[PDB]
Every structure is written in structure tokens, then in C-alpha cells.
Fold this protein.
Amino acid sequence: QRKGIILAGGSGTRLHPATLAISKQLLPVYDKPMIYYPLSTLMLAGMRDVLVISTPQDTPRFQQLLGDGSQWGMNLQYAVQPSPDGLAQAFIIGEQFIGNAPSALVLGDNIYYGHDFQPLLKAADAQSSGATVFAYHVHDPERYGVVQFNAQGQAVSIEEKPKAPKSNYAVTGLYFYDQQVVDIAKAVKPSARGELEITSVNQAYMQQGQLNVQTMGRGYAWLDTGTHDSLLDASQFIATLENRQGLKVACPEEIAWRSGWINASQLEALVQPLTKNGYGQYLMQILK
Amino acid sequence: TQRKGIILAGGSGTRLHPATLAISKQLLPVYDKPMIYYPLSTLMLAGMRDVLVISTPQDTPRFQQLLGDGSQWGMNLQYAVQPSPDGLAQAFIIGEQFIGNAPSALVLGDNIYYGHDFQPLLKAADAQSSGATVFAYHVHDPERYGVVQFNAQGQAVSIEEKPKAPKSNYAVTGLYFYDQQVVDIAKAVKPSARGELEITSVNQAYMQQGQLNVQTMGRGYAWLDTGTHDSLLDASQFIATLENRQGLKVACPEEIAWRSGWINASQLEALVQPLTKNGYGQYLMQILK
């Protein structure tokens, strides 16, 4: 079975002074901490074992929020990235956690929503070999890293903020890998930015012809969490869908229950501290 | 002004979980800044440089790391702890040594105010020589608040805590100004029918002496509900609207301290050097030039 990693990196001064008090990935997006969203993405793909990698200052904060995950039928582990030396180090730090299993990496600030998102994840999870990146259709591909892929979904090029974009599909912060990634990451050399870039990992799979692309088009949302304005917009987006459509985005208790990881009695125990708000009353509605 | 201010930032409750599993409520961002900046800036607008932050044993260090001793803003910030959430009136018992023989003010850590004329309104409450001043705000559901009736001369006729049965639509907000009597009054407060050492009991004592004045925050004033996730999002939308649409800045302590003369432009430009990346710091740059 596949094991997941959440990389929650340095908050930056970009969100000060709000992030003077809390790390970015602990800020609330509507009613729940940001980290719930990338976590529930791993949960939707079927992963119960997740390693949270963060900075020395922020890792204990995540441990306080989430614990060991056994409340969701999960096994959560924590490790620290001491210096922000690139995304690919997640596979070096998480090497013992991964073992010989397939893995997945999601960035701590990536919020996805789509009606068919779970089938898309399970299809990527079902791939026997190679790697999978997740592309999001944008009207301005120049701003992101852009992936070009062939009619069968196999990546042909990956270009960072291309002046002339070869496609309209931006690479998002979600990656699935077979057993080769731990060794591939170890051979990554520091880029012009001084970091072990995940793009170099994806380049190795593509150069081997083993990099597949899942496209998130019509029906999908990929929210920007970079600025105060965009975070407020992300909060409004979640509140709109949840209040209008009678659903919850990134509710770990619900996902664990619907997946069979906890029973209805365990879910009712989790709801007792949440009875005061719509989050807990939502869970009580599905119990009845 | 020798008036000394208190922010009561006590227990948040599970009402905002799971957001508040990670941080206490008064550290959540309301748009671009921690919630505590808003009530703090309210005390600063009224002229108070000495502020006591009262919080829980667990949360007081987190506020200490955020705000420090306030000397970066020409203020003096002190800290004290409320070990159990027994009543707003306990703020004056915990705050007795900080207050001394000075007039005082109490604001709640989750109270966000805005008004174009709010500062003259605060300065007027500060200038009252005696008695107490509460702030009245029109609500559609007075049953959830403290409710006050007043005689147009600013004198209260009655004040009731969560009445059944509300005698008016004017809620008493979480902002209170007091003379030197409040500590002893607060010490004599008995637990209410809801088992709380209520600030309404304190205000009832002032009213029975004919010393309870009422300032109206009417048309143009906002008093934001921070009780629920929906209401918190409404509060962020509101702050963002004023700042993005009207070029206004709500609750920027750096700005207030500078315009009040508590720091000079050199001290303010030094504060912006670590904040240069965002629009918050660029605003401080824009007003400096």
C-alpha cells in the first residue's frame, strides 16, 4: 500500500503579521486548519500512513493539532526539515518511512476540490509503475510550471514559468511515485535556486518515459493560498460550496467514516466536542 | 491620559473548532492581522499606552511572543492570567495591581470595532471624570447580549444580562470605561443566575448611583460578531472591503503609535524592514512618504 507525505514549508513573511502568530499551514481556511485540506487529499486517495515534514519551529505545532491520527483510523508520523533545501529532500528524510512502498507527496498549502477528485486519485494510485503529476488548466500558463503531455497522458516536457508555454496545464503540488523515487531524489543536484527541486525528480521519470499526467479541468478547483486576498477568497470558496451544496471539503472525520476506517460509534465520539458549530452538526446529520 | 487598559483574551470555547484546535481564537487572523490587534488598537485610539493582556495559562505565552512588551510601539504591555473563565468582572480583580489608583478601561479580546468618528467617541469616554461609560449598539437579537435603556442624556435606565424579555434593541458591547471605584465594585460582585461574575453586575452598580453613561455607536459603526465561522468570515470580508475598496486601515498598531507620536518616523521605518514583502508593510511605507 502507498504511503503519503505532506511537506509543510516555511511560511515566509508574505502573510505577516497574521503569520507572526501561527504558521501559514495552520491558518484557518473557512472553518478548518489549512493542513486538513492536503491531508484529506491523501486520505481520499486511500492512504492511512502519512508523514508530516515541516520546519523545526512548526513540526510540534502540527503534532499538537493532529496527534497520531488514530482518531481517524490513521497512522501519522512527523519529521523535520532543518533547512529549506528543496522539495526533493522530503524523500530523503522520509526514506525510512517510505521503505519499499509506493509513495505520494502533497504540498502543505495545496487545496483541491472536485466531484470526481477521488476517482482521479484512485486511478493514479492504481498505476503499477512510474510517476504521476497533477495538472490544472489555467488561463495564464506563464505564471506556473507548465507540463506538456501526449494524447495518452504521458508527459513530454516540463517548463518552469515558460515565456512561451507549451500547454495550458500547470503542475500542482501533488505527486505519486513508485519505489524508485527515494533513489532518484538522492541523485538530484542543487538547482540555480540552491535547492533540490521536485522538477528534477519528475524530469528523471519523464526522461525514462514513465511520467504520467492527470488533468484537472472542468469541475475542479485549485485554490491560491499565497496572499491575504487569495486566502480570504479560498475561505469564501469553501464556505459557498459547503453551505450551498450540503457537503464538507476536507473533513477527515467524514472521509475516515465513509472509507470504513472508523465505525459510527467512533465518529459519534469525535463529534461531541464539535456539537457547537456546523462542522459537528454536519457529522451528526450523516450519523442519522 | 493616565487611564490604563485591559484586554481580556480568555477561553475561546470549542465553538470555533477545528480551527481553534491549533490556535486560540484571539490569535486567528481577521483578514491580514491577528484578532488581538483590533481590541488593542481600540485601546491605543483612546490614548492608552499601558495595557494589561489577561489570558489563559496556555495562551499567555503566545501573546507574549506576538506582542512583546510593546516598547516597539512606544507602549508598555504587561501580562496576567485568568486560570478559569469565571467572569469578565474578574479582569479588575486580576488587574488590581496593574490598575492601581488610576481610571481604567476593559475591552474583550474578540471585539472588533470600526467607525469614522470612533476615536472622538473614545476620547470623550476617556475624558469623563467619574462614573462609567458603556457603548450601545443596535442588534436584531438583543436576547443574546447585555441590553441597556437610556434617557437620551446618556444616562442608563436599566441594564440586563441576556434578557428573555429584552427591554430595548441596544446591546452593551465589550468596551467599558471606569473611574477608581471599579476594582472594589468588581471585588463585591456575586455570581449571577448564570454562575458568572458578570460585567453587567458592575455596570448595574454604577447605574444605581446614577453614574452609568452610555455612548451610542449608531449609524456608520460596525461591531463585528466573531462568534462563529460564518461570522468570522463576514468580519474578514468587511475589513478587506474597507482596506481594498476605500483605502482604509483598521487596527494597525504601528500606524496608530506613529500618528499618536509614541514613535517617530525613524522608529517606524525600522519596524517595516522585516515586513517589506507584503501589502501591510507597503502601507506603512506609503504613509511614511
The radius of gyration of chain B is 18 Å. The interface with chain A takes residues 13-19, 21-23, 27-29, 31-34, 37, 62, 66, 228-230, 232-233, 236-237, 240, 244, 274-281 of chain B (CB under 8 Å). Residues 73 and 257 of chain B are 6 Å apart (CA to CA).
